[PDB]
Every structure is written in C-alpha cells, then in structure tokens.
Amino acid sequence: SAELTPILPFLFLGNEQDAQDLDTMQRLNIGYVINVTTHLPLYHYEKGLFNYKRLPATDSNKQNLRQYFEEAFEFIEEAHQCGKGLLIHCQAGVSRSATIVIAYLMKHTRMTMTDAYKFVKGKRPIISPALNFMGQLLEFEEDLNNGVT
Numbered sequence: 001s002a003e004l005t006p007i008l009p010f011l012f013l014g015n016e017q018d019a020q021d022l023d024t025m026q027r028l029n030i031g032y033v034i035n036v037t038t039h040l041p042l043y044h045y046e047k048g049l050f051n052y053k054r055l056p057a058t059d060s061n062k063q064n065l066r067q068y069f070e071e072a073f074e075f076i077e078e079a080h081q082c083g084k085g086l087l088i089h090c091q092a093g094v095s096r097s098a099t100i101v102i103a104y105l106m107k108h109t110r111m112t113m114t115d116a117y118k119f120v121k122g123k124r125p126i127i128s129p130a131l132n133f134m135g136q137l138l139e140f141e142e143d144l145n146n147g148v149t
Contacts (some may be wrong), residue, residue: 002093005124010085011076013101013124015093019043024049031084034072036096051075057096059130065099066136070149072100073107098127104142113141 004014012018013027017032020043031050035042038056045052053075055068072088079086090097098120105116112147118139120127129137143149 002124002126004087005093007062007101007120007123010080011101011104012087013097013120013127014087014089014091016040016041016043017092019087019089021122022047022049025087028086029085031082031085032075032079032086034075034086034088034097034100036090036100038087040091042126047081048100051079052076055096055100057090058100059090059096061130062137063096065096065103065133066140069100069103069133069140073104076104077108080131092126093124094126094128094129095133098124099129099133099146100136102129106137106141106144110144113137 002013004012004018004056007013022044033050033052036055036057042052057065072093076086088097102116102120107115
C-alpha cells in the first residue's frame with residue numbers, strides 16, 4: 001500500500017492501515033483522527049489516545065461530502081491551534097478523505113481547486129476523487145470565490 005502522506009506538518013492523509021499504526025501516530029505527534037467512512041472502526045479508540053471524528057460518508061456516487069467540510073476543517077484547526085497533528089483517512093486514502101483534504105487546502109491556503117488537487121496528487125499520487133466529489137470541489141471553489149461559505 002501507499003505510505004501515509006504528510007500534507008502539512010500537522011495534517012496527514014492516509015488509509016485504514018495508517019489509522020491502526022499507533023507507533024507512527026505518536027511519533028508524528030498526531031492527536032486527532034478523522035475517519036471518513038460510516039463503517040470502519042475508530043481504531044485504538046478504547047485506548048483514549050486520540051480525539052476522533054467520524055464523517056460517516058458512503059462511497060456512493062450520490063454522497064454529499066460538502067456537508068462535512070465545515071466540521072472537518074474545524075477539527076483540523078482545533079488540532080493545529082493546539083500543536084498536534086491530525087490523521088485523516090478512509091479505506092485507501094484515495095477519494096473520500098482526499099476530497100476533504102483538497103477542500104481544506106482550497107479554504108485554508110486559498111489554493112485554486114486545480115492547484116490544491118495537484119498539491120495533493122504530487123504528494124500522494126494514489127488519489128483519485130470520484131467524479132461527483134470532483135463536482136462538489138468545483139462548486140465549493142465557486143462558493144469560496146464569491147463569499148458563499
């Protein structure tokens with residue numbers, strides 16, 4: 001499988017196996033986890049090492065992920081303002097979780113959607129957001145550029 005991907009020093013985009021790797025997470029000072037699926041476990045939850053957030057998306061071509069952007073970004077920013085890293089993952093780290101990361105970069109570093117996509121794709125060549133997620137990213141780009149959330 002692909003390696004866990006540092007996106008920023010406090011933001012890592014990875015897969016379900018990355019989400020089980022306690023050693024790495026503690027090494028990277030990761031205190032927060034976003035699990036972008038409805039059905040995977042919150043790995044290591046009972047250890048009470050991390051602050052977890054489930055974004056219970058299905059990988060269906062109807063899924064709305066825009067719905068979760070605001071809340072995802074608040075949790076990343078909570079991790080950042082307190083000096084910890086955040087791991088965000090789905091099963092493989094290719095579509096659902098990669099879309100949130102791209103959206104966070106468009107919002108919090110004002111990258112265009114193309115530039116944010118190429119930024120993530122350069123660091124994690126695995127990514128391939130589903131077309132309906134690509135559609136939601138373009139609409140979020142319009143919304144960001146007029147002041148509509």
